[PDB]
Design a protein around this nucleic acid. Sequence first.
RNA 1: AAACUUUCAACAACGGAUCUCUUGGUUCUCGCAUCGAUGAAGAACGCAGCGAAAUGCGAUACGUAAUGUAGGUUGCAGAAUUCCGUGAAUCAUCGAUCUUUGAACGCACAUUGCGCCCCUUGGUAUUCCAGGGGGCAUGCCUGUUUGAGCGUCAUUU
RNA 2: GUUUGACCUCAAACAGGUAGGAGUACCCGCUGAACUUAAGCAUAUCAAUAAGCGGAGGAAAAGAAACCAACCGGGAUUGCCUUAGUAACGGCGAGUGAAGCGGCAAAAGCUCAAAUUUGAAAUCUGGUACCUUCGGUGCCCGAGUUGUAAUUUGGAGAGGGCAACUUUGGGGCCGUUCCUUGUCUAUGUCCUUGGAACAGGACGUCAUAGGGGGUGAGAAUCCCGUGUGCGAGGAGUGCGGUUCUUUGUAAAGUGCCUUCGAAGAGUCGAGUUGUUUGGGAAUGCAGCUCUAAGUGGGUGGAAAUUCAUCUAAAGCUAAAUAUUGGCGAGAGACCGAUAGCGAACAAGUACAGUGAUGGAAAGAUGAAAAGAACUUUGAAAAGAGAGUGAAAAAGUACGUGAAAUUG
RNA 3: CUCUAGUGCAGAUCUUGGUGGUAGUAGCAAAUAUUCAAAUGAGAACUUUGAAGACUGAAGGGGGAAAGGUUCCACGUCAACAGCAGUUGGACGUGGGUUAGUCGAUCCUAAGAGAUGGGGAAGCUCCGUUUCAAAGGCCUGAUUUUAUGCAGGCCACCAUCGA
Lengths: 51, 48, 86, 116, 80
Amino acid sequence: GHQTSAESWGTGRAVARIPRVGGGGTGRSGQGAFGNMCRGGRMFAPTKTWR
Amino acid sequence: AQKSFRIKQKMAKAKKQNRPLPQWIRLRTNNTIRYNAKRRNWRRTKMN
Amino acid sequence: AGVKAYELRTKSKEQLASQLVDLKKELAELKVQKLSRPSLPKIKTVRKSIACVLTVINEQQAAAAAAAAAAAAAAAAAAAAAAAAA
Amino acid sequence: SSDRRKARKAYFTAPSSQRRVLLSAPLSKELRAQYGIKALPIRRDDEVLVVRGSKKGQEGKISSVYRLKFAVQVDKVTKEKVNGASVPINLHPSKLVITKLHLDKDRKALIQRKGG
Amino acid sequence: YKVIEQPITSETAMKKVEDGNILVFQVSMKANKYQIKKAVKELYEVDVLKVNTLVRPNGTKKAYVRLTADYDALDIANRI
RNA sequence: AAACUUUCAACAACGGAUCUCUUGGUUCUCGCAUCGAUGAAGAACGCAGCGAAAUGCGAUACGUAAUGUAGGUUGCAGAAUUCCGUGAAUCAUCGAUCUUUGAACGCACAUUGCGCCCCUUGGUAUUCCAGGGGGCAUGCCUGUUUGAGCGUCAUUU
RNA sequence: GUUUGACCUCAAACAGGUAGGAGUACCCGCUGAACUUAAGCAUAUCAAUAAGCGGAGGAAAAGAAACCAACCGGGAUUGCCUUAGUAACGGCGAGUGAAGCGGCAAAAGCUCAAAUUUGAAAUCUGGUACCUUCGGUGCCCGAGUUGUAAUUUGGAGAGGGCAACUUUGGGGCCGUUCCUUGUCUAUGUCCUUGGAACAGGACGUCAUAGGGGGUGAGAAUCCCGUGUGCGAGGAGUGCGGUUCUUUGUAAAGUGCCUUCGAAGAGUCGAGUUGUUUGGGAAUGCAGCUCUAAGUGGGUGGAAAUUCAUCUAAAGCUAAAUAUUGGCGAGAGACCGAUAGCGAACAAGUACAGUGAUGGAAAGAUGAAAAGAACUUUGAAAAGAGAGUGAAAAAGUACGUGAAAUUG
RNA sequence: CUCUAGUGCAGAUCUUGGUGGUAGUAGCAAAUAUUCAAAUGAGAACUUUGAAGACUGAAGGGGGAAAGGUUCCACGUCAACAGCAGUUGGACGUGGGUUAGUCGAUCCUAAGAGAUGGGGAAGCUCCGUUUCAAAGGCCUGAUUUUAUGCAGGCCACCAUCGA
């Protein structure tokens, strides 16, 4: 999920406070792995081998 | 300007690649779109 | 195609002197083919008579070289111990 | 392993050694009852026949064998063209069966080497 | 590397051989003014004066092979 | 009044979902495990019957050689040309291979361009260039030819 | 003036070999932080690590006692299970948190001296002279035997010589094992609806191989493969067995005679600090500066005192273990084009930014392409008859198809 | 026949894209008149040519360097694509043409800076280059040639880099 960078910006341009577009980001959202509601960001419960 | 030596064949490479998208591509696919991403246009991009 | 590898190795230095000069005589025709549109039934004979005449000439170098003596010089048998540094 | 695409991986970028074998088709019943062998690889001047198919049990030969394509042109399975040329036409060799096996120099000694 | 590839024998080399003397060449790239002239002098059988250089945006260096007065021009060019 | 407006039916038409698909995974399990100055990984620009161009090749260019493997002619390909049918040639190996250029490296530079110092070889008027070859002043280390200061302080004059 | 030489300090050019770079993870060392927590709070703590740089290797990296138990007893390093939140520290607040003992795995041990003060027959070395091409010859620096012993001091504990050779090693030969090549892969045919049979129906066999995937439809017998047997040809990396020399040289075991041995100082630690939370605070450990003894010195968390125990300040060493850049195989309650590798497909290629870089659109016929001859209308686009083919109710923009949009 | 997980959608000025909306409405690029006839053609205000007029002429004339790099050129096409048509284009595609001792690519002085080695010191770096160095004259010995070239001895009187 941390394979992109997308930043906060807010109003003044057409993007939200949510990390959608920033330093790249087509359908690759999140600053790191962030935004599960955002498609292509993270997951709610990302499955792990540790559990 | 005055051009040096190793600028010239980088520019020659760029203008050789200014030719069309290869016509062998849609013989494998047949019809269906494969679009590409380089060449050079004179007004737009320069070379590296 | 033209000459052949295993035949050149089993030659003598007196014959290999003729191989060097007389093979690259036909090479003059091959460059003219590039200009007049190439075609493989003439143009294809352009490769292996660079080293294959020189290496078989250097059979008389290498097989004589194990009887040297001096100090200093490298390129002959010196970069042979690369995978024997440890 | 147990995988569709990753099993096909080996078949696709198979080396030229394996592509000899993978030009396969079965042998006919009186070739089995003569020798023993299951299948043997498929080559140009073999007489061929169609097994499973609408071209059912017809006589043929092969015209071309191809290396990377795998598919072979089949003689007697012949249609025309728009321009009108009677060409041999393609089939994959699994849909075929060979009736010829040659004897030759030492394909004679291949089929009867050490095991046979 | 090594010097001479071939002449370039388009309609352009059929201008400047009838009128303006030279044979237009297309040699290798690092093949300079001295190297190209004496390499023509031994190989082709013609005596050679100033031979010049110019690279196009194609990357290939041309050579402008000027001849002497006792030799010909037409029977120098068309021999191959 | 059904044009403008609304619904149904019959007859279709411009847009277009999901799933079975699939030479592509992920994750887990077992066994082995890098190449290079003899010129690495990688680009340049050459090499087809016809040719955009795959794929191989690259001054004995779809290869190059000896042996065990009958019908060869890779790919877009249909076709044309050429050789053979009970010893054509296929594939593994060993040997051949190593154009220009990148560590790149005669050397500076803005990769595929491009010029110095020395030796060898060839031509020519003494001269100058060409054909071609090499290094801590492209890393390190040794032997041989062969060097100095100064003191505790030498043997003889 | 002048004649003849050694060590400190401490060079430059010719000429055999030897080497550069591209790369990921694993470890050791060094300059060496912080977002943070006690809801805050400079000294608990993120922490000896990041990030940067250095060092060593194929494993890294450690280690064989200046140890524990506690008078009963034992004896390296490393990994795992018991252990331990115990024993302590911190506004005793977050937090951090051992050792010993029993069991399991795999467990072998060695290099330096009476210090050192060191010199020759010969052994024998770094540099270097003549010969002038790794072969022959010569000198100094020097290591122990040795030519040959002390210095500063001490004990009754204990050692050394001499003889017999054997084992290792080296040489020679065989057996076992590994690698590579090469070959047979068992087991199958019929019938019927039909466009194709892998269904259904009928009769057998292999099966060790019925995991799998591909195959004109469901598969052991259609295919690619697997289980299982066989021809030989090379190699010493491992393992086993056998044979020769007692190896004119090096060690051990056995047996006999005769007689008596040691020590490493900038360290022990210190005025004071500190790498350690200095608190009564061991140890690990030495900034500025100095500085100690071998019947004597040191470990065991205060000291007098007593008992058990170890002997540095030079140095080395196998495994249990950690991990990937390349390749192959198998599987996991593990996807089926919004998933997942950047990307299934000419995805780094029409493009955009000076710029390590960002980076979209994007899958698709059938058995066979036969991919629409021919005829007719229109100017190409467009519109109708006719052929090919299993079906054209499969027509190339080639699966199933809804709606806004739109007759 | 029963056990297991990323397990029920209407919403944070959210998120992945198409489609709706104002709307076929405005815009359609700074007020340097345009009128008329032809060539060619399927189509002509625009290409191209003629007649005629507006217009500028210290520039609508002429012309070099940096920067860019073949965009000029001839050949060749009207599909995508040009604020419209379009017979047209650098869009599209293919090849050619650029010939220097001669025009630029050098030494030394300034702004200013570099290369190398060891040390002072914790690195950076400053310092050394200033005496040898570098360069030149004179003398001697061995070898070889059409010539030559080398080694040793002797000469104090000068020393950083860039328009």
